[PDB]
Amino acid sequence: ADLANGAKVFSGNCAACHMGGGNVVMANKTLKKEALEQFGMYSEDAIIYQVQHGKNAMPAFAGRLTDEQIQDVAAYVLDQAAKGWAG
Ligand code: HEC
């Protein structure tokens, strides 16, 4: 319904550092849900704050993406990992 935009942003910005719900910089913090939620933060508000300002080595997106994707792109990962991360 609206997360279609999520993949539009993750597949055009977050993909450069994830692509396949698999972190491309770290070796654990991923997008699927086990690692990003292993420690605790696989929730919209979680990655939403890790997206509006990346975190550690991730590039903020408070205004890099569009806006409805700094949001949708988060709920987006909750939709892709919850049923086949764009498998
Ligand atoms: C390359 C550098 C980037 C880019 C362009 C994006 N991410 Fe993000 N991401 C990156 C690193 C190095 C890490 C680990 C840093 C950390 O989280 O401590 C992450 C992590 C995430 C996570 C996990 C958050 C956590 O559990 O701490 C998520 C959910 C995540 N990244 C999402 C995400 C999205 C949707 C992107 C586009 C807005 C995105 N990242 C880009 C590095 C990078």
Helices marked H in 11-87: 44-51, 68-80
Pocket test for ligand 1, best of 13, 17, 79 (most atoms within 8 A of CB): 17
Which residue type, as a one-letter code, is found at position 85?
W
Burial of 49 (0-12, 13-18, 19+ CB in 10 A): middle
Q: Is 26 in the pocket of ligand 1 (CB under 6 A)?
A: yes
| Architecture in CATH for domain 1-87 | Orthogonal Bundle (1.10)
Question: Which positions ≥6 away from 19 have C-beta within 8 Å?
Answer: none
Question: Which positions ≥6 away from 43 have C-beta within 8 Å?
Answer: 37, 78
Backbone dihedral angles phi then psi of residue 58, each to the nearest 5 degrees: -95, 140
Rounded Cα distance, 87 and 83, in Å: 9
What are the domain boundaries of the chain?
A: 1-87
Question: Which positions ≥6 away from 9 have C-beta within 8 Å?
Answer: 61, 65, 66, 69, 70, 72, 73, 76
CA atoms within 13 A on the CB side of 39: 9
Q: Is 19 in the pocket of ligand 1 (CB under 6 A)?
A: no
Instruction: Find tokens 């890099």 and name the residue.
Output: 64
Contact (CB, 8 A) for 84 and 62: no
